[model samples]
Target: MYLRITNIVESSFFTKFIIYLIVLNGITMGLETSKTFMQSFGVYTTLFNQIVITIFTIEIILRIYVHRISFFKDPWSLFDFFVVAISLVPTSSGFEILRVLRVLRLFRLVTAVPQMRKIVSALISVIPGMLSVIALMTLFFYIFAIMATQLFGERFPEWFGTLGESFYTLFQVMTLDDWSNGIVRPLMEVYPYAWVFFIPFIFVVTFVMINLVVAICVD
Candidate 1:
Protein backbone atom coordinates (compact mmCIF):
# COMPACT_ATOMS: atom_id res chain seq x y z
CA MET A 1 0.00 0.00 0.00
CA TYR A 2 2.75 2.49 0.93
CA LEU A 3 4.78 1.70 -2.20
CA ARG A 4 1.70 2.08 -4.41
CA ILE A 5 0.91 5.50 -2.89
CA THR A 6 4.54 6.60 -3.27
CA ASN A 7 4.50 5.60 -6.93
CA ILE A 8 1.27 7.48 -7.54
CA VAL A 9 2.57 10.61 -5.81
CA GLU A 10 5.77 10.56 -7.80
CA SER A 11 3.88 10.02 -11.05
CA SER A 12 1.23 12.71 -10.47
CA PHE A 13 0.71 15.60 -12.91
CA PHE A 14 1.62 18.02 -10.09
CA THR A 15 5.02 16.30 -9.85
CA LYS A 16 5.57 17.06 -13.56
CA PHE A 17 4.62 20.70 -12.97
CA ILE A 18 7.14 20.87 -10.14
CA ILE A 19 9.82 19.43 -12.43
CA TYR A 20 9.07 22.11 -15.04
CA LEU A 21 9.38 24.79 -12.36
CA ILE A 22 12.79 23.44 -11.37
CA VAL A 23 14.10 23.54 -14.96
CA LEU A 24 12.72 27.07 -15.37
CA ASN A 25 14.55 28.13 -12.22
CA GLY A 26 17.82 26.75 -13.61
CA ILE A 27 17.35 28.82 -16.79
CA THR A 28 16.59 31.86 -14.65
CA MET A 29 19.95 31.40 -12.93
CA GLY A 30 21.66 32.12 -16.27
CA LEU A 31 19.32 35.01 -16.91
CA GLU A 32 20.26 36.49 -13.56
CA THR A 33 23.95 36.26 -14.47
CA SER A 34 23.28 37.92 -17.84
CA LYS A 35 21.72 40.88 -16.01
CA THR A 36 25.23 41.63 -14.78
CA PHE A 37 26.38 41.99 -18.43
CA MET A 38 23.22 43.68 -19.76
CA GLN A 39 21.67 46.02 -17.25
CA SER A 40 18.47 46.51 -19.27
CA PHE A 41 17.50 42.83 -19.37
CA GLY A 42 15.55 42.39 -16.15
CA VAL A 43 14.50 38.72 -16.30
CA TYR A 44 12.80 38.41 -12.94
CA THR A 45 10.06 40.99 -13.01
CA THR A 46 8.20 41.40 -9.70
CA LEU A 47 5.02 39.77 -11.06
CA PHE A 48 6.89 36.80 -12.53
CA ASN A 49 8.86 36.19 -9.36
CA GLN A 50 5.69 36.28 -7.33
CA ILE A 51 3.99 33.84 -9.69
CA VAL A 52 6.87 31.38 -9.48
CA ILE A 53 6.98 31.65 -5.72
CA THR A 54 3.23 31.00 -5.58
CA ILE A 55 3.63 27.80 -7.55
CA PHE A 56 6.38 26.65 -5.22
CA THR A 57 4.23 27.48 -2.19
CA ILE A 58 1.39 25.37 -3.58
CA GLU A 59 3.74 22.51 -4.37
CA ILE A 60 5.08 22.47 -0.84
CA ILE A 61 1.55 22.44 0.54
CA LEU A 62 0.67 19.53 -1.68
CA ARG A 63 3.74 17.60 -0.61
CA ILE A 64 2.80 18.08 3.01
CA TYR A 65 -0.77 16.99 2.38
CA VAL A 66 0.28 13.91 0.46
CA HIS A 67 3.06 12.74 2.74
CA ARG A 68 1.77 13.99 6.10
CA ILE A 69 4.30 13.61 8.95
CA SER A 70 6.86 11.99 6.70
CA PHE A 71 7.10 15.14 4.55
CA PHE A 72 9.39 17.02 6.95
CA LYS A 73 11.61 14.03 7.73
CA ASP A 74 13.64 14.26 4.51
CA PRO A 75 16.33 16.91 4.53
CA TRP A 76 15.62 18.06 0.99
CA SER A 77 11.93 18.47 1.75
CA LEU A 78 12.80 20.57 4.79
CA PHE A 79 15.15 22.65 2.64
CA ASP A 80 12.40 23.23 0.09
CA PHE A 81 9.97 24.34 2.81
CA PHE A 82 12.49 26.65 4.42
CA VAL A 83 13.31 28.29 1.09
CA VAL A 84 9.65 28.83 0.24
CA ALA A 85 8.81 30.18 3.68
CA ILE A 86 11.68 32.65 3.62
CA SER A 87 10.65 33.78 0.14
CA LEU A 88 7.11 34.46 1.37
CA VAL A 89 8.19 36.83 4.14
CA PRO A 90 6.51 40.24 3.87
CA THR A 91 8.69 43.15 2.68
CA SER A 92 9.64 45.92 5.09
CA SER A 93 12.68 48.06 5.84
CA GLY A 94 14.30 45.37 7.94
CA PHE A 95 12.77 42.48 6.02
CA GLU A 96 14.20 43.78 2.75
CA ILE A 97 17.43 42.02 3.68
CA LEU A 98 15.53 38.75 3.46
CA ARG A 99 14.84 39.45 -0.21
CA VAL A 100 18.34 38.27 -1.00
CA LEU A 101 17.41 34.95 0.57
CA ARG A 102 15.11 34.35 -2.37
CA VAL A 103 18.12 32.87 -4.12
CA LEU A 104 17.76 29.84 -1.86
CA ARG A 105 14.58 29.06 -3.77
CA LEU A 106 16.88 27.60 -6.42
CA PHE A 107 17.37 24.56 -4.16
CA ARG A 108 13.84 23.59 -5.08
CA LEU A 109 15.46 22.12 -8.18
CA VAL A 110 17.11 19.41 -6.10
CA THR A 111 13.86 18.41 -4.44
CA ALA A 112 11.74 18.49 -7.59
CA VAL A 113 13.09 15.22 -8.97
CA PRO A 114 15.21 12.17 -8.19
CA GLN A 115 17.86 12.91 -10.83
CA MET A 116 18.66 16.41 -9.54
CA ARG A 117 18.68 15.08 -5.99
CA LYS A 118 21.31 12.52 -6.98
CA ILE A 119 23.43 15.15 -8.74
CA VAL A 120 23.32 17.52 -5.76
CA SER A 121 24.23 14.65 -3.45
CA ALA A 122 27.25 13.85 -5.59
CA LEU A 123 28.41 17.47 -5.62
CA ILE A 124 27.94 17.85 -1.88
CA SER A 125 30.08 14.78 -1.34
CA VAL A 126 32.95 16.51 -3.16
CA ILE A 127 32.63 20.00 -1.60
CA PRO A 128 35.31 19.53 1.06
CA GLY A 129 38.00 18.68 -1.49
CA MET A 130 36.88 21.54 -3.75
CA LEU A 131 37.06 23.98 -0.83
CA SER A 132 40.60 22.87 -0.01
CA VAL A 133 41.67 23.63 -3.59
CA ILE A 134 40.00 27.05 -3.36
CA ALA A 135 41.84 27.78 -0.14
CA LEU A 136 45.17 26.92 -1.75
CA MET A 137 44.39 29.15 -4.73
CA THR A 138 43.58 32.03 -2.35
CA LEU A 139 46.91 31.53 -0.58
CA PHE A 140 48.74 31.66 -3.92
CA PHE A 141 46.95 34.92 -4.77
CA TYR A 142 48.09 36.61 -1.55
CA ILE A 143 51.65 35.39 -1.94
CA PHE A 144 51.79 36.76 -5.51
CA ALA A 145 50.18 40.02 -4.36
CA ILE A 146 52.96 40.65 -1.84
CA MET A 147 55.71 39.69 -4.30
CA ALA A 148 54.30 41.97 -7.02
CA THR A 149 54.09 44.85 -4.55
CA GLN A 150 57.71 44.46 -3.41
CA LEU A 151 59.27 43.93 -6.89
CA PHE A 152 57.35 46.55 -8.89
CA GLY A 153 56.12 48.89 -6.16
CA GLU A 154 58.60 51.63 -7.01
CA ARG A 155 59.30 51.10 -10.74
CA PHE A 156 55.75 50.22 -11.90
CA PRO A 157 53.60 51.59 -9.09
CA GLU A 158 50.64 51.81 -11.49
CA TRP A 159 50.44 48.04 -12.11
CA PHE A 160 51.17 47.06 -8.54
CA GLY A 161 49.14 49.96 -7.20
CA THR A 162 48.37 48.17 -3.94
CA LEU A 163 48.19 44.64 -2.58
CA GLY A 164 44.45 44.66 -3.32
CA GLU A 165 45.01 45.71 -6.93
CA SER A 166 47.62 43.00 -7.39
CA PHE A 167 45.14 40.41 -6.12
CA TYR A 168 42.54 41.75 -8.58
CA THR A 169 45.06 41.39 -11.43
CA LEU A 170 45.80 37.84 -10.26
CA PHE A 171 42.09 36.97 -10.61
CA GLN A 172 42.03 38.48 -14.11
CA VAL A 173 45.03 36.37 -15.09
CA MET A 174 42.93 33.25 -14.48
CA THR A 175 40.35 34.12 -17.19
CA LEU A 176 41.29 36.97 -19.59
CA ASP A 177 41.33 35.98 -23.30
CA ASP A 178 44.78 37.39 -24.19
CA TRP A 179 46.14 37.27 -20.64
CA SER A 180 49.80 37.12 -21.72
CA ASN A 181 49.46 40.05 -24.08
CA GLY A 182 47.41 41.95 -21.50
CA ILE A 183 49.95 41.51 -18.70
CA VAL A 184 53.19 41.42 -20.69
CA ARG A 185 52.53 44.38 -23.03
CA PRO A 186 51.47 46.73 -20.23
CA LEU A 187 54.43 45.83 -17.97
CA MET A 188 57.08 45.79 -20.72
CA GLU A 189 55.82 49.22 -21.87
CA VAL A 190 56.22 50.69 -18.38
CA TYR A 191 59.22 48.85 -16.96
CA PRO A 192 61.15 46.48 -19.20
CA TYR A 193 62.20 44.60 -16.03
CA ALA A 194 58.49 43.97 -15.24
CA TRP A 195 58.86 40.44 -16.63
CA VAL A 196 60.26 39.68 -13.20
CA PHE A 197 56.73 40.23 -11.86
CA PHE A 198 54.72 38.97 -14.91
CA ILE A 199 56.35 35.59 -15.50
CA PRO A 200 55.98 34.13 -11.99
CA PHE A 201 52.46 35.59 -11.62
CA ILE A 202 51.41 33.85 -14.83
CA PHE A 203 52.94 30.55 -13.67
CA VAL A 204 51.04 30.59 -10.36
CA VAL A 205 47.66 31.52 -11.83
CA THR A 206 47.80 29.58 -15.10
CA PHE A 207 49.73 26.47 -14.02
CA VAL A 208 49.21 26.21 -10.26
CA MET A 209 45.58 27.26 -9.87
CA ILE A 210 44.40 25.52 -13.03
CA ASN A 211 46.06 22.22 -12.10
CA LEU A 212 44.85 22.34 -8.50
CA VAL A 213 41.21 22.92 -9.54
CA VAL A 214 41.42 20.14 -12.15
CA ALA A 215 42.92 17.70 -9.63
CA ILE A 216 40.23 18.44 -7.09
CA CYS A 217 37.37 18.01 -9.61
CA VAL A 218 38.88 14.78 -10.89
CA ASP A 219 39.13 13.32 -7.40
Candidate 2:
Protein backbone atom coordinates (compact mmCIF):
# COMPACT_ATOMS: atom_id res chain seq x y z
CA MET A 1 0.00 0.00 0.00
CA TYR A 2 2.86 2.42 0.84
CA LEU A 3 4.63 1.63 -2.41
CA ARG A 4 1.37 2.08 -4.36
CA ILE A 5 0.74 5.48 -2.81
CA THR A 6 4.35 6.55 -3.51
CA ASN A 7 4.03 5.64 -7.18
CA ILE A 8 0.75 7.52 -7.53
CA VAL A 9 2.19 10.62 -5.86
CA GLU A 10 5.15 10.64 -8.24
CA SER A 11 3.06 9.98 -11.36
CA SER A 12 3.09 12.46 -14.21
CA PHE A 13 -0.71 12.46 -14.46
CA PHE A 14 -1.01 13.51 -10.82
CA THR A 15 1.52 16.29 -11.38
CA LYS A 16 -0.35 17.54 -14.45
CA PHE A 17 -3.65 17.53 -12.57
CA ILE A 18 -2.15 19.74 -9.85
CA ILE A 19 -0.76 22.10 -12.47
CA TYR A 20 -4.21 22.35 -14.08
CA LEU A 21 -5.77 23.22 -10.71
CA ILE A 22 -3.18 25.95 -10.17
CA VAL A 23 -3.96 27.40 -13.60
CA LEU A 24 -7.69 27.33 -12.86
CA ASN A 25 -7.13 29.06 -9.52
CA GLY A 26 -5.06 31.72 -11.29
CA ILE A 27 -7.97 32.43 -13.65
CA THR A 28 -10.38 32.53 -10.71
CA MET A 29 -8.24 35.17 -8.97
CA GLY A 30 -8.07 37.25 -12.16
CA LEU A 31 -11.86 37.18 -12.39
CA GLU A 32 -12.09 38.37 -8.78
CA THR A 33 -10.16 41.51 -9.73
CA SER A 34 -13.21 42.68 -11.69
CA LYS A 35 -15.76 44.35 -9.41
CA THR A 36 -18.53 43.73 -11.95
CA PHE A 37 -17.80 40.00 -12.40
CA MET A 38 -17.33 39.52 -8.68
CA GLN A 39 -20.53 41.42 -7.83
CA SER A 40 -22.66 39.66 -10.44
CA PHE A 41 -21.27 36.14 -10.07
CA GLY A 42 -19.93 36.03 -6.54
CA VAL A 43 -21.62 32.72 -5.81
CA TYR A 44 -19.87 31.00 -8.69
CA THR A 45 -16.57 32.59 -7.73
CA THR A 46 -16.88 31.44 -4.13
CA LEU A 47 -17.80 27.91 -5.23
CA PHE A 48 -14.79 27.69 -7.53
CA ASN A 49 -12.47 28.97 -4.81
CA GLN A 50 -13.82 26.44 -2.32
CA ILE A 51 -13.37 23.62 -4.84
CA VAL A 52 -9.77 24.59 -5.55
CA ILE A 53 -8.92 24.86 -1.88
CA THR A 54 -10.42 21.45 -1.24
CA ILE A 55 -8.33 19.97 -4.06
CA PHE A 56 -5.15 21.58 -2.67
CA THR A 57 -5.91 20.42 0.86
CA ILE A 58 -6.38 16.90 -0.42
CA GLU A 59 -3.13 17.19 -2.36
CA ILE A 60 -1.29 18.22 0.80
CA ILE A 61 -2.68 15.32 2.76
CA LEU A 62 -1.82 12.71 0.11
CA ARG A 63 1.72 13.97 -0.30
CA ILE A 64 2.25 13.96 3.45
CA TYR A 65 0.81 10.45 3.66
CA VAL A 66 3.23 9.27 1.00
CA HIS A 67 6.35 11.07 2.16
CA ARG A 68 5.49 11.04 5.88
CA ILE A 69 7.92 12.98 8.08
CA SER A 70 10.45 13.42 5.28
CA PHE A 71 8.01 15.63 3.37
CA PHE A 72 9.08 18.56 5.54
CA LYS A 73 12.73 18.17 4.48
CA ASP A 74 12.40 19.54 0.94
CA PRO A 75 12.26 23.33 0.69
CA TRP A 76 9.89 23.02 -2.27
CA SER A 77 7.58 20.89 -0.18
CA LEU A 78 7.66 23.49 2.60
CA PHE A 79 6.71 26.17 0.08
CA ASP A 80 3.77 24.11 -1.18
CA PHE A 81 2.66 23.40 2.39
CA PHE A 82 2.72 27.08 3.33
CA VAL A 83 0.82 28.15 0.20
CA VAL A 84 -2.02 25.79 0.98
CA ALA A 85 -1.77 26.24 4.75
CA ILE A 86 -2.11 30.01 4.57
CA SER A 87 -5.44 29.68 2.79
CA LEU A 88 -6.84 27.86 5.83
CA VAL A 89 -6.19 30.79 8.15
CA PRO A 90 -9.32 32.67 9.25
CA THR A 91 -9.30 36.38 8.42
CA SER A 92 -11.92 38.94 9.42
CA SER A 93 -13.40 42.15 7.99
CA GLY A 94 -10.53 44.23 9.35
CA PHE A 95 -8.13 41.91 7.49
CA GLU A 96 -9.20 42.81 3.97
CA ILE A 97 -5.55 43.51 3.15
CA LEU A 98 -4.55 40.06 4.37
CA ARG A 99 -7.39 38.57 2.33
CA VAL A 100 -6.01 40.13 -0.83
CA LEU A 101 -2.60 38.57 -0.15
CA ARG A 102 -4.20 35.13 -0.50
CA VAL A 103 -3.91 35.71 -4.23
CA LEU A 104 -0.24 34.77 -3.76
CA ARG A 105 -1.46 31.19 -3.67
CA LEU A 106 -1.47 31.47 -7.46
CA PHE A 107 2.31 31.59 -7.26
CA ARG A 108 2.16 27.86 -6.52
CA LEU A 109 2.23 27.59 -10.29
CA VAL A 110 5.94 28.40 -10.11
CA THR A 111 6.65 25.26 -8.13
CA ALA A 112 4.13 23.25 -10.18
CA VAL A 113 5.96 24.07 -13.44
CA PRO A 114 9.36 22.41 -13.82
CA GLN A 115 10.89 25.27 -15.81
CA MET A 116 9.88 27.88 -13.25
CA ARG A 117 11.09 25.58 -10.50
CA LYS A 118 14.54 25.42 -12.07
CA ILE A 119 14.68 29.20 -12.61
CA VAL A 120 13.71 29.92 -9.02
CA SER A 121 16.23 27.38 -7.74
CA ALA A 122 19.00 28.82 -9.89
CA LEU A 123 18.27 32.37 -8.69
CA ILE A 124 18.23 31.25 -5.08
CA SER A 125 21.57 29.49 -5.52
CA VAL A 126 23.11 32.70 -6.87
CA ILE A 127 21.92 35.05 -4.10
CA PRO A 128 25.18 35.24 -2.14
CA GLY A 129 27.24 36.24 -5.18
CA MET A 130 24.48 38.60 -6.34
CA LEU A 131 24.41 40.40 -2.99
CA SER A 132 28.12 41.20 -3.20
CA VAL A 133 27.67 42.78 -6.62
CA ILE A 134 24.61 44.69 -5.35
CA ALA A 135 26.61 46.15 -2.47
CA LEU A 136 29.35 47.37 -4.84
CA MET A 137 26.75 48.91 -7.15
CA THR A 138 25.10 50.69 -4.19
CA LEU A 139 28.43 52.24 -3.23
CA PHE A 140 28.79 53.57 -6.76
CA PHE A 141 25.32 55.13 -6.58
CA TYR A 142 26.19 56.95 -3.33
CA ILE A 143 29.47 58.27 -4.70
CA PHE A 144 27.90 59.43 -7.97
CA ALA A 145 24.98 61.07 -6.12
CA ILE A 146 27.36 63.19 -4.08
CA MET A 147 29.38 64.11 -7.19
CA ALA A 148 26.23 65.10 -9.09
CA THR A 149 25.02 67.23 -6.17
CA GLN A 150 28.28 69.22 -6.19
CA LEU A 151 28.55 69.58 -9.98
CA PHE A 152 24.98 70.26 -11.21
CA GLY A 153 23.30 71.19 -7.91
CA GLU A 154 23.69 74.96 -8.40
CA ARG A 155 22.26 74.92 -11.94
CA PHE A 156 19.24 72.56 -11.82
CA PRO A 157 18.17 72.62 -8.21
CA GLU A 158 15.25 70.35 -8.95
CA TRP A 159 17.20 67.30 -10.19
CA PHE A 160 20.55 67.91 -8.51
CA GLY A 161 19.86 70.31 -5.65
CA THR A 162 20.47 67.69 -2.94
CA LEU A 163 21.84 64.17 -2.66
CA GLY A 164 18.30 62.79 -2.67
CA GLU A 165 17.41 64.59 -5.92
CA SER A 166 20.66 63.42 -7.53
CA PHE A 167 19.92 59.82 -6.43
CA TYR A 168 16.41 59.94 -7.94
CA THR A 169 17.59 61.54 -11.20
CA LEU A 170 20.40 59.04 -11.54
CA PHE A 171 17.93 56.19 -10.88
CA GLN A 172 15.65 57.56 -13.62
CA VAL A 173 18.63 57.80 -15.97
CA MET A 174 19.56 54.21 -15.07
CA THR A 175 16.15 53.08 -16.27
CA LEU A 176 16.27 55.26 -19.44
CA ASP A 177 13.02 56.77 -18.19
CA ASP A 178 12.80 59.78 -20.48
CA TRP A 179 16.26 60.86 -19.33
CA SER A 180 16.81 62.61 -22.66
CA ASN A 181 13.82 64.82 -23.46
CA GLY A 182 12.40 64.98 -19.95
CA ILE A 183 15.64 65.47 -18.03
CA VAL A 184 18.90 65.89 -19.95
CA ARG A 185 17.78 67.75 -23.11
CA PRO A 186 17.16 71.04 -21.33
CA LEU A 187 20.41 70.74 -19.40
CA MET A 188 22.34 70.04 -22.61
CA GLU A 189 21.50 73.60 -23.73
CA VAL A 190 23.92 74.88 -21.11
CA TYR A 191 26.28 71.96 -20.51
CA PRO A 192 26.67 70.53 -24.00
CA TYR A 193 29.10 67.94 -22.59
CA ALA A 194 26.43 66.60 -20.21
CA TRP A 195 26.26 63.57 -22.48
CA VAL A 196 29.78 62.60 -21.42
CA PHE A 197 28.63 62.24 -17.80
CA PHE A 198 25.23 60.63 -18.47
CA ILE A 199 26.26 58.24 -21.25
CA PRO A 200 28.82 56.55 -18.98
CA PHE A 201 26.39 56.47 -16.04
CA ILE A 202 23.82 54.65 -18.18
CA PHE A 203 26.42 52.20 -19.41
CA VAL A 204 27.62 51.45 -15.88
CA VAL A 205 24.18 51.11 -14.27
CA THR A 206 22.15 49.36 -16.98
CA PHE A 207 24.87 47.51 -18.88
CA VAL A 208 27.78 46.83 -16.58
CA MET A 209 26.06 46.42 -13.21
CA ILE A 210 22.53 45.15 -13.89
CA ASN A 211 23.16 42.98 -16.96
CA LEU A 212 26.43 41.73 -15.55
CA VAL A 213 24.65 40.36 -12.46
CA VAL A 214 22.13 38.56 -14.67
CA ALA A 215 24.88 37.00 -16.75
CA ILE A 216 26.68 35.80 -13.67
CA CYS A 217 23.52 34.21 -12.32
CA VAL A 218 22.83 32.46 -15.63
CA ASP A 219 26.37 31.08 -15.62
lDDT winner among the candidates? Answer: 2
For model 2, how does the per-residue alpha-carbon lDDT over 63-97 read when each residue is reduced to its tens digit? 99998879899788888898787786765666676
Off by over 4 Å in 2: 1-8, 11-13, 91-95, 119-131, 142-169, 184-200, 210-218
Q: Which candidate is the best by TM-score?
A: 2
Residue-by-residue lDDT tens digits, candidate 1, 1-219: 666655656676768878787677657655666646346656445556678889788767766767888888988889989989998987556767697787877777667777778988887777787677678878878888898777666765665778987776767766655657877677677678777766676676677667766776678
Score candidate 2 by lDDT. 0.85
Q: Please give me the total number of clashing residue pairs in predicted model 2.
A: 0
Task: Please give the TM-score that candidate 1 achieves against the real structure.
Answer: 0.59
Model 1 clashing residue pairs (backbone): none
Clashes of each: 0, 0
